[PDB]
Design brief:
The structure is cut from a larger assembly and holds eight protein chains of seven kinds. Chain D is mainly alpha-helical and 213 residues long. Chain D is 46% helix and 7% strand. Chain D is elongated, with a radius of gyration of 20 Å. Chain F is 0% helix and 52% strand. Chain F is built from no helices and ten strands. In chain F, the strands form three sheets. Chain F has a four-stranded antiparallel beta sheet, with no helix packed on it. In chain F, strand 2 and strand 3 form a beta hairpin. Chain G has one domain. A two-stranded antiparallel ribbon of chain G has the order 1-2. The longest helix of chain G has 15 residues. Chain G is globular and about 55 Å long. The two termini of chain G are 17 Å apart. The chains are: A alpha+beta (125), B alpha+beta (266), C mainly beta (63), D mainly alpha (213), F mainly beta (102), G mainly alpha (143), H mainly beta (277). Chain G binds one RNA strand of 196 nucleotides through helix 1, helix 2, helix 3 and helix 4. Chain F: This is U3 small nucleolar RNA-associated protein 15.
Chain lengths: 125, 266, 63, 213, 102, 102, 143, 277
RNA sequence: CGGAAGGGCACCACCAGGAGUGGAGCCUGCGGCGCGCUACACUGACGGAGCCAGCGAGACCUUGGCCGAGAGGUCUUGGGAAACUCCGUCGUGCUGGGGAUAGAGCAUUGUAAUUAUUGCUCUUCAACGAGGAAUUCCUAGUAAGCGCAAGUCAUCAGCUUGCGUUGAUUACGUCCCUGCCCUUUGUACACACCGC
């Protein structure tokens, strides 16, 4: 069957399922193109991974993201995390782990919360 | 991190941590920024061992696919790694690659030593590794004892910034025509122990201070290190001591300003 | 006005100084020798650069 | 002479991606509108505290900058400015609105003076941070003022605070709006106009220090 | 800087089998599990042979002229080595379990 | 692609293909007198009957980017420089012309 | 190659379709469009009284088609915002069901929608085709 | 992998003769680790060792030029294909995909090497120009230009020293870090056929069509040995242990092997080239 | 009984800032004291548009249909929050911020006293112009803003307690002041340090 990988991103209480499969190069969120995320100032906050890594990878890859829960900001952060994780998972499973490591290095160099969640667990003095 | 850290070590300068997790990736963090400077995968460059009582292969099992022991080098540039596997892998930090991989023991009695079996028991494992604070050797404590790898052979032509006119014969001619500074510089440019030794024991006392004054700052560390590793097992004490006193006198402030570079030398 | 730059070298602890104000030793950036004991107000740490309107004066304690 | 070819099929995506988006690819800007290169801190002693090195698209990183003691110094300067902006009773917790304000302010700075919004911001901050200040020595009851220096992080904090309060004060009850008043404040501050609230206050602080040093 | 040779083995000064003295009597050869440790007595030093075997060494012997070293593990696998260079010359396979060499 | 027309307390921006009221300016108190674009095609300046001109960016009527007070007499004509980007000229009923920098 | 409002933005599509309905004309607006209030929680009628009814109709079509079938009560729940009762804290207020139903009846009379079993209001095939046509129009609106 | 057709002849015939070859062991049994560049072919093949089979990757040059040279990186992930038209393509071996492409020589690229550190890469072609690239980034560090066309390049990664066999009958030893000629070995009276470094990096063995095999001591920069063989040596290599010399001549199916007395003892270093000859 | 020396800790202290109460309206606990909620607008208001949560499961809710501006009533089915954001109107005037109160009208609830309560609509536009003296509270998903749900033996119904959403500035040092606490037989075990 078709190559497919599935990842999860999670901000405060926002979950984002990211499905990645080999396809024509379309990025849809909630059945709409990614160019129409809601808050419209954080459109680039969610464009981050694409412009961080380049796009030809996305030209070969097809991406689908479903979000539920959280606010606007939390949902946006969940979306970007889900895309980053899913992209690296796909590159790990179906293409060279050399490029896997280049992707992971670029993401973590830019902003690590693209990959590992920032679980804000409390602090008592 | 992404999974169970189980080994840790720290840059000698005191700025970074290197942590090996259970995926077999040696991540490296900057402390004050609490951020990830970079990680080194290790999953593929590990020679695990098969077990005669196993039902599966020596590749597709994660029996020892990770490193339970990490340590830095004393220039902060290299890492030694060892685990329950059969391999001791020597990576280097700043460029995220491996320099070497040693196999701890070929002994089919020890369990995880055959990669393919030839058609409870002692296993082989490296419990803990360290470099040497003299940074010419490192030790690995394993099921069979304390192995100690070293470099004290120096059978190797590792020159440095040579040029066409720097030859051993030219060095001898420099000695005969009494440019001791030039002879020493050329000796290090060649970087050969016997030639270094010859010129070093050739130059005279009433001229050691001038040479120590005029040695270039690139060669201060190499000369200090050589003097130390020679003066341990050499019998010309005040030769070595006049040399060291002249060196410290001529160039002390430089060493104080870059202490971390002359660590092993001092 | 001619101002001067300096680099902090050591924060001086255990001197009894008024809260918020901190002792500090600086060495001038221009010439690396000469050093002055100044006072600072904000959060200060080692090896940062600090601006002096005056070079001559040296801070004393502030009770 | 020498070239490297990295892209081989021209990039097309099933989802249309705007052209300004591909230019943002070519080099990260701010708001997809302004580059960080040639943005230098015209004043020593304060670089390595006011940070514009690593690029950023919108000033909305959620990084933890209040844990340790100088992660503020590691914050990007624009996000610090917007956070300080979103500070008053009716303002708390609207970072999106603060971002909108900062964007319009940057646009207005370019429109008025052509040079660079971010360079203007950095220049204004460096120029308006105070340099000496007087603590209140009790003297056992003889309350006087003593002149001391001020650390770079305090200089930056106070520069931002002065600018933000100045804009809010000057647009509190006035036909102007916060965006344009902030632009006016920033431009005059870069000028060192002495007609801006920030420069006036800095001069007063430094004058008091000069007096009773 | 990135080259390391196995230069020493610490712990387990004797594991199994024959112990021998060198011609000059200045050196004691001991078999450790796979390899052979040389203890130089008068100069107070040690040393361990780089080559290993396949199983535990079962017997050793040193040529009287202090040149050759035969070492046999538990299955006739025998390695004949030089000293004055410390290299493996040959390795033959005596098919039955050896018990002693001289 | 656009042009500005003065009217009663009202400045109207029209397009070329559409030829429709694109932008509305009504923040004046009395009837406007002069309207002029800048060389960069961003700022339009209007001289009103209050003797205080208002210049602000096009396509943003909801901002009075600048309100410059001329003589008390109503201002008649207001123009940008062509070669220069940041100088303005005005004339009012005070029979005096005023050159203004931003 | 086949697009939809799923691929078009919201506000641009709503404005374009409202303009299309203005120009088309046959919508049969009610007579009291210029006095009606649109919500009991609101406190002054819509500003653009000339076509706010058309904007509501277009937004209703978008909502139904993004969804699949919606009642007048569901529309009222969706549209009705919160009020300001003053000294006391606020509470949620529904929308104007009357306006919602004149919108819904007008869309049925036009033929944009069809009726929906299990009770409900669904999008008609012809209305769907015209919606895709206008979505493509506003996509290639960029010439 | 696509499952598509291969368009070709219905009967089996072997590949053209193998001209160039490179091999690494760092990742055996996990994917391909040999590149072979075939004679008069516009693409090189991958070979897998532990599987003892031809792998599933073919490496094109995208420049319509025959593959004059190949190499492969110490990490085992990158393989380089240097065309006859100056195209230095860089491929990723796991997925056989294309990653990069360099264009500096306009003549045929006759040798590629990448450091044992995956930082610097050195290229050498017939036009007489050597190009020091960075590989982590994608820039050009420097560009030297020797006198005559370069025949071949052997890289020694322990000491960052690589030797170029030229056409004016010389070997030139150049070190990569400081980017300049350190040694210049003269003496071969005829075309130089093959040459190689010692594992300790102190010797170069060079065999040339005067039926001669010489060994040069690098430090003194002088020929310490010269052997007159009857059949010219068409290839020569050391074992990683410096104790075997494997040479291949022009007649005979075999591969002559040599032991290393200098391994088992010392050897004087006196230049004797013309002394015998 | 007192003094000295040394060391520690604290938003009852220093230092930097933030946010309140106290002014006005409203609610209500202690009897003048005190706690909540709404205001004083342009970082707004107003109008169209966009939509993103989680806790909660003992004649009732309701999906849908019909009319009614609204409130609401009528016929059928079973046991998706606000702040927010996008465009548009308004402009500094106690004005459009503020809706007290007053008048009139429209429906619902019980019931019969033309009794009371609730909701909607018109018109009426008050005080309030950022709150003195003082004073308290506060260091990270913290101050503060915003809505939602439940009343699970106490306490709470113009209120308690949960849950979700948005999310900062300034200290993170110092014993200088204000306090408070400890020590003045190393007791224990190398090295060093100290020495009534």
């Amino acid at each position: 069957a078709v190559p497919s990988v599935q990842t999860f991103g999670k901000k405060k209480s926002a979950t984002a399922v990211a499905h990645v499969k080999a396809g024509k190069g379309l990025i849809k969120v909630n059945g709409s193109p990614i160019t129409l995320v809601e808050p419209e100032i954080l459109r680039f906050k969610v464009y981050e991974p694409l412009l961080l890594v380049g796009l030809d990878k996305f030209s070969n890859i097809d991406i689908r993201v479903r979000v539920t829960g959280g606010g606007h900001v939390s949902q946006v952060y969940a979306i970007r995390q889900a895309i980053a994780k899913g992209l690296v998972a796909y590159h790990q499973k179906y293409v060279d782990e050399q490029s896997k490591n280049e992707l992971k290095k670029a993401f973590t160099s830019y902003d690590r919360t693209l990959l590992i969640a920032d679980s804000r667990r409390p602090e008592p003095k | 991190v992404y999974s169970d850290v189980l080994a840790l070590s720290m840059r000698p300068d005191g700025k970074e941590v290197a942590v090996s997790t259970l995926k077999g990736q040696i991540s490296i963090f900057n402390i004050e920024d609490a951020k990830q400077v970079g990680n080194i995968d290790c999953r593929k460059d590990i020679i695990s061992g098969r077990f005669n009582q196993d039902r599966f292969t020596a590749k597709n099992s994660e029996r020892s696919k990770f490193f339970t022991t990490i340590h830095y080098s004393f220039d902060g540039m290299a890492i030694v790694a060892g685990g329950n596997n059969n391999s001791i892998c020597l990576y280097d930090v700043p460029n995220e690659v491996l320099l070497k991989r040693f196999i701890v023991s070929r002994n089919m009695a020890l369990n995880g030593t055959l990669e393919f079996l030839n058609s409870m028991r002692p296993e082989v494992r490296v419990t803990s590794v360290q470099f040497s604070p003299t940074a010419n050797a490192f030790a690995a404590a394993s099921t069979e004892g304390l192995l100690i790898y070293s470099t004290n052979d120096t059978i190797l032509f590792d020159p440095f910034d040579l040029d066409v006119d720097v030859t051993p014969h030219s060095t001898v001619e420099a000695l005969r025509e009494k440019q001791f500074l030039n002879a020493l510089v050329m000796a290090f440019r060649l970087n050969e122990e016997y030639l270094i030794n010859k010129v070093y024991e050739a130059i005279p006392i009433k001229e050691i201070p001038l040479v120590a004054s005029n040695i270039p700052a690139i060669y201060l560390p190499r000369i200090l290190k050589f003097i130390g590793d020679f003066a341990i097992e050499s019998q010309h004490i005040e030769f070595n001591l006049i040399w060291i006193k002249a060196l410290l006198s001529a160039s002390g402030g430089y060493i104080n300003e870059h202490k971390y570079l002359f660590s092993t030398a001092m | 006005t001619p101002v001067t730059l300096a680099k902090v070298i050591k924060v001086l602890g255990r001197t009894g100084s008024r809260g918020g104000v901190t002792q500090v030793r600086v060495e001038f950036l221009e010439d690396t020798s000469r050093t002055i004991v100044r006072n600072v107000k904000g959060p200060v740490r080692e090896n940062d650069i600090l601006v002096l309107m005056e070079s001559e004066r040296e801070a004393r304690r502030l009770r | 002479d020498f070239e490297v070819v990295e892209e081989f099929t021209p990039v097309v995506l099933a989802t249309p991606i705007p052209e300004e988006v591909q230019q943002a690819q070519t080099e990260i800007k701010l708001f997809n509108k302004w580059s960080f290169e040639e943005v230098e801190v015209k004043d020593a002693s304060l670089v390595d505290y006011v940070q514009v090195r690593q690029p950023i698209f919108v000033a909305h990183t959620a990084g933890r900058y209040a844990n340790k003691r100088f992660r503020k110094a590691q914050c990007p300067i624009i996000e610090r400015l917007t956070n300080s902006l979103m500070m008053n009773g009716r303002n708390n917790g609207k970072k999106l609105k603060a971002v909108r304000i900062i964007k319009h302010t940057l646009d207005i700075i370019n429109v008025l003076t052509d040079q660079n919004p971010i360079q203007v911001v950095v220049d204004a901050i460096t120029n308006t941070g105070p340099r000496e200040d007087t603590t209140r020595v009790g003297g056992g009851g003889a309350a006087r003022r003593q002149a001391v220096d001020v650390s770079p992080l305090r200089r930056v904090n106070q520069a931002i605070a002065l600018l933000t309060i100045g804009a809010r004060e000057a647009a509190f009850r006035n036909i102007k709006t916060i965006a344009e008043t902030l632009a006016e404040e920033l431009i005059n501050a870069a000028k060192g106009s002495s007609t801006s609230y920030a420069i006036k206050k800095k001069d007063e602080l430094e004058r008091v220090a000069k007096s009773n040093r | 800087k990135s080259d390391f040779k196995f230069s020493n083995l610490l712990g387990t000064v004797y594991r199994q089998g024959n112990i021998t003295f060198s011609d000059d009597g200045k050196q004691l050869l001991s078999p450790v599990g796979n390899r052979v440790s040389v203890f130089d007595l008068i100069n107070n030093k040690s040393f361990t042979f780089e080559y290993e075997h396949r199983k535990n060494i079962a017997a050793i012997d040193l040529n009287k002229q202090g040149t050759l070293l035969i070492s046999i593990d538990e299955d006739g696998r025998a390695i004949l080595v030089n000293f004055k260079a410390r290299n493996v010359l040959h390795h033959f396979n005596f098919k039955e379990k050896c018990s002693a060499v001289k | 692609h656009d042009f500005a027309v003065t009217s009663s307390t009202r400045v109207q921006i029209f397009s070329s293909r559409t030829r429709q009221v694109i932008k509305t300016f009504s923040r004046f108190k009395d009837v406007v007198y002069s309207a002029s674009f800048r060389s960069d095609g961003k700022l339009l300046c209007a001289g009103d009957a209050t003797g205080l001109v208002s210049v602000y960016d096009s396509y943003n009527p909801r901002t009075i980017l600048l309100s410059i007070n001329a003589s008390t007499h109503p201002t008649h004509v207001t123009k940008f420089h062509t070669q220069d980007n940041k100088i303005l000229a005005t004339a009012s009923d005070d029979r005096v012309t005023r050159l203004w920098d931003i | 190659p086949g697009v939809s409002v799923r691929d078009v933005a919201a506000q641009d599509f709503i404005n374009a379709y409202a303009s299309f309905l203005q120009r088309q004309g046959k919508l049969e607006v009610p007579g009291y469009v210029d006095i009606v209030k649109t919500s009991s929680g609101n406190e002054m009628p819509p500003q653009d009284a000339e076509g706010w009814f058309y904007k509501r109709a277009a937004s209703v079509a978008r909502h139904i088609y993004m969804r699949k079938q919606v009642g007048v009560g569901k529309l009222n729940k969706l549209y009705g915002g919160a009020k300001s009762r003053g000294v006391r804290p606020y509470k949620h207020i529904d929308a104007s069901g009357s306006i919602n139903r004149k919108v819904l009846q007008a869309l049925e009379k036009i033929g944009i929608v069809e009726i929906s079993p299990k009770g409900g209001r669904r999008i008609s095939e012809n209305g769907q085709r015209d919606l895709d046509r206008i979505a493509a129009q506003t996509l290639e609106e960029d010439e | 992998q696509d499952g598509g057709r291969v368009g070709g002849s219905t009967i089996k015939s072997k590949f053209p003769e193998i001209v160039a070859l490179a091999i690494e062991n760092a990742r055996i049994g996990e994917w391909e680790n040999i590149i072979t560049a075939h004679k008069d072919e516009k693409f090189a093949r991958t070979w897998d060792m532990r599987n003892k089979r031809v792998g599933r990757w073919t490496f094109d040059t995208t420049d319509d030029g025959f593959v004059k040279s190949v190499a492969m990186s110490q990490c085992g992930n990158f393989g380089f294909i240097g065309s006859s038209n100056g195209s230095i393509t860089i491929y990723n071996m796991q997925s056989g995909i294309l990653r990069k492409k360099y264009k500096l020589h306009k003549r045929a690229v006759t040798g590629i090497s990448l450091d044992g550190m995956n930082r610097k890469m050195v290229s050498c072609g017939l036009d007489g120009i050597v190009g020091f690239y960075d590989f982590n980034k994608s820039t050009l560090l420097g560009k030297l230009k020797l006198d005559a066309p370069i025949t071949a390049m052997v890289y020694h990664r322990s000491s960052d020293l690589f030797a170029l066999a030229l056409d004016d009958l010389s070997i030139v030893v150049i070190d990569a870090v400081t980017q300049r000629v350190v040694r210049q070995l003269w003496g071969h009276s005829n075309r130089i056929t093959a040459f190689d470094f010692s594992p300790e990096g102190r010797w170069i063995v060079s065999a040339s069509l005067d039926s001669t095999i010489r060994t040069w001591d690098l430090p003194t920069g002088g020929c310490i040995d010269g052997i007159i063989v009857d059949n010219v040596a068409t290839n020569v290599k050391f074992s990683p242990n410096g104790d075997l010399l494997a040479t291949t001549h022009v007649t005979g199916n075999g591969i002559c092997i040599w032991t290393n007395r200098a391994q088992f003892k010392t050897v004087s270093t006196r230049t004797i080239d013309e002394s015998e000859f």
